[PDB]
Structure formats: C-alpha cells, structure tokens
Amino acid sequence: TIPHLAIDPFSLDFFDDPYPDQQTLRDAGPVVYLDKWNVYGVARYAEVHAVLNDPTTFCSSRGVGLSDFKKEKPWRPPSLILEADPPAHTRPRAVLSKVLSPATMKTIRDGFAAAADAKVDELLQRGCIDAIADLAEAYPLSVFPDAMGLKQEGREHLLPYAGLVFNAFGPPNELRQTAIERSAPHQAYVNEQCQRPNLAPGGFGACIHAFTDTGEITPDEAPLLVRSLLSAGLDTTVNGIGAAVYCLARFPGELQRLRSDPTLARNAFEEAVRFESPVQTFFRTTTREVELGGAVIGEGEKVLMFLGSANRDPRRWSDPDLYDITRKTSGHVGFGSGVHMCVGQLVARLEGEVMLSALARKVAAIDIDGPVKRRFNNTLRGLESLPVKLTPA
C-alpha cells in the first residue's frame, strides 16, 4: 500500500537539485517509505502541515533528526525547546517568545537597518562581490552576535557550530560524521558563552537569564536556551538572505518591482523563504500507530517531512516554481507550523526585510558574474558562493 522509494534525500545529488525527486516523492503518494534510511516520508503540503500540527502523535522529544533518542544517545544534551514536547516545551517556548517578542523588535530595528544600509553602501564601493561571504554571511555576523551579547573573540566558531547542528539532524553519513569529529572546539566555545557572566547586558542572552526569577525557567535552564539561539538563529538567516539575493539575481523583473515599491521588502523575503526553504527537512517520531493520508504508520517510527517540497506543492500553490514577491505567502511552512513554529521568525524577517529594503533603495541591478557554488548540509539549503555585480541606483 505504501510505495517504497530508493531516493536518498541526504545525498549530494539530491542537494544539488532536489526538485525532480521532490515531485517523484509527492506524486508517489501522500506517504512513502524511504528504504535507504528506514523512515516514512511526507512531501505534499497537506501531510507536512498535518504532521507539524499534531505534536502529540508526531512528537519532537525523540529527536527531530534521524536518530531516535529512545534508541541512541543524543550527540549533545537535548534542546529544552526544539527537542521537547508539551507540556515540557511550553514554558521554555514562552520565555524565548518574550525574549524575541513583537515588542523586542522595536529595540533592535534601528541598528539592524543602519547596518544593512551600511553593508550595501560598502558593497557598492567594490561593485563585484560574493553575495554569500560578503553579504549573506557578513550582514548577520555584523548584527546577530552583538544582539545576543557575545564578546568579539571566538565568533568564528558560530557558523561551524550551526552547520554541525544542522548536519547532525541527518543520517550518519559522511557529512554528519565529519561534522561531529570536528565539533569539540565549537561546542566548548558555545557552551561557555551561554553562561550568564559572558552575555552582555540588554542582549538576548542576558534577557533569557533574567527570566530565571519569574518561575518560567530555572537558572540551570537558561544556558541551554541561549544555546538554542546560537544554534538556530545565525546560519538559518545566512541562508535566508542568500536565498533572497539569489532569487533577485535570477528574477530581475522581481528586483524591478521591489525597487519600484520597497515596502514589498518583507514579502519579498518571505517569498524567498518559501521558494528556497533554508530549512529543507526534519523529522518527527510517532508515539502511537496512526493513519496519515490513508496509510497506517506504526508506533516509534521516524517521519521525514519535506518542507521545501510542501512549499512547492502545486496542490497548494499556484505556479509554485515561480518567485513572486506579491504572492500571498501565508501558510508556507518554511518556518514550520504549530507549536514549534520558528520562535525566531520576527528576528529573521527583520534582518531579511531591512537588507532587501537597502537593496531596493540602493541597487539598480544584481547580475551573476562568476561560478555559483552550492553548500552541502543534511538539512540546510543554500549557497557557498554567489559572485554578483551590484550596479548602483
């Protein structure tokens, strides 16, 4: 009844161009079985959305990677938020929601916007730049560590640590095993910065520690919650901003619409998140036997969700393979859906918006002018190098 496929969604060929295989996965049925890894897969919007929105049946506390925490030891202590189910999830989630709240965005927006305008001005002096190292990486590095309250020294550990975290959700392939082999110095740095004395006053880390006297979290939970933001809040935004620049470089008509109405910047970024989906895949584990899209899945089974595929499913989206900055994007699953839906989404959207607003106001053209190179990770999609010429407005 359930079709069995040999597609390896963690292979380099798949990362190089996942879109044909994603259609094959959607069109094979609502639920497939991936023989390479002994997991169920869901690639259509409907089932991805259903799984995300039933956290009781499709839990997170057995891990959101391939590894089942009931069978193997987690590679690092479990996250108190991502790898927790309700009710243990609820109070840590509420703390991070308040630390990254609608109200908190008002304290950082002026500085984030000024940094984005300054970066675009600097890049325009050079003309030909690498939109990954020089923009997608450089901009979030220029704002997010400081907003966290991290010291300057050792920040070179942050992107390697995040790449490790996202590789470690995958299967025990070479990408994952090499990442873990190299991990000790990055883990050591990250764990140390999570302690209260190492986080500058007023930043996100200090604010998490301040919540430890409200009864929502205890002091010994705060370092792991700081760890969550250092894991999840940098490399994702690098790949989101890189995706947006790549979309504007490939679709110049949409750059022209964005220049003509810079208030489209926030939706242009949201559409890039749908179109490229920085976070491509991750897992749940069933807590009982369950019927999903007509298939029966037993207890204790890993279920792989294809978020990028859900975001391109023609059953849900008109012209899914077009980048359209005025699309009604509400309902895309690039930030997840339901109780775990990205708690950092307002930070991500703020960074993306202000960078795209700077480009909309300052840049007339974005032309790819060198070899584009992809960066490979078990669950993140993005580029290693994106040579572009920026022409000033």
Ligand X SMILES: O=C(O)c1ccc(-c2ccco2)cc1
Smallest gap from Cβ 21 to ligand X, in A, equals 21
Buried b (16+ CB within 10 A) or exposed e, 344-374: bebbbbbbbbbbbbbbbebbebbeeeeebee
Smallest gap from Cβ 40 to Cl ion, in A, equals 29
Residue in the structure block whose two tokens are 């890894």: 37
- Confirm or reject binding of residue 344 to ligand HEM (CB under 6 A): yes
Smallest gap from Cβ 5 to ligand X, in A, equals 23
First to last CA, the chain: 58
> Among ligand HEM, Mg ion, ligand X, none, what binds residue 93 when CB lies within 5 to 8 Å by partner kind?
ligand HEM
Cα(359)–Cα(121) distance, integer angstroms: 9
Three-state SS at 364: strand
Site string for ligand X, 78-117 (x = CB under 6 A): -x-xx-----------------------------------
Question: Pick from 111, 108, 110, 121: which is nearest to 361 by CA?
Answer: 121
- Confirm or reject binding of residue 160 to Cl ion (CB under 5 A): no
Of 77, 219, 298, 370, which one interacts with Mg ion (CB under 5 A)? 298
- Confirm or reject binding of residue 311 to ligand HEM (CB under 6 A): no
Site string for ligand HEM, 258-287 (x = CB under 6 A): ---------------x----xx--x-----
Of residues 263-292, those binding ligand X (CB under 6 A): 279, 282
Which residue of this chain has its Cβ atom nearest to ligand HEM in the complex? 344
Q: Cα-Cα-Cα-Cα dihedral of 245, 246, 250, 256, to 10°?
A: -10
Measured from the CB atom, is 139 or 161 closer to ligand X? 161
Q: 87: cis peptide before it, omega within 30°?
A: yes
Q: Which residues are annotated as a binding site for heme b?
A: 89, 93, 284, 340, 342
- Give φ, ψ of 390 to 5 degrees: -100, 120
Question: Pick from 313, 311, 315, 288: which is nearest to 299 by CA?
Answer: 288
Cα(286)–Cα(302) distance, integer angstroms: 7
Smallest gap from Cβ 176 to ligand HEM, in A, equals 18
- Confirm or reject binding of residue 76 to Cl ion (CB under 5 A): yes
Residues 294 and 52 sit within 8 Å (Cβ to Cβ): no
Residues of this chain that interact with ligand X (CB under 6 A) are 79, 81-82, 165, 227-228, 231-232, 279, 282
Q: Which residues sit at the interface with ligand HEM, rule CB under 6 A?
A: 60, 64, 81-82, 93, 96, 100, 228-229, 232-233, 236-237, 240, 273, 278-279, 282, 334-336, 340, 342-344, 347-348
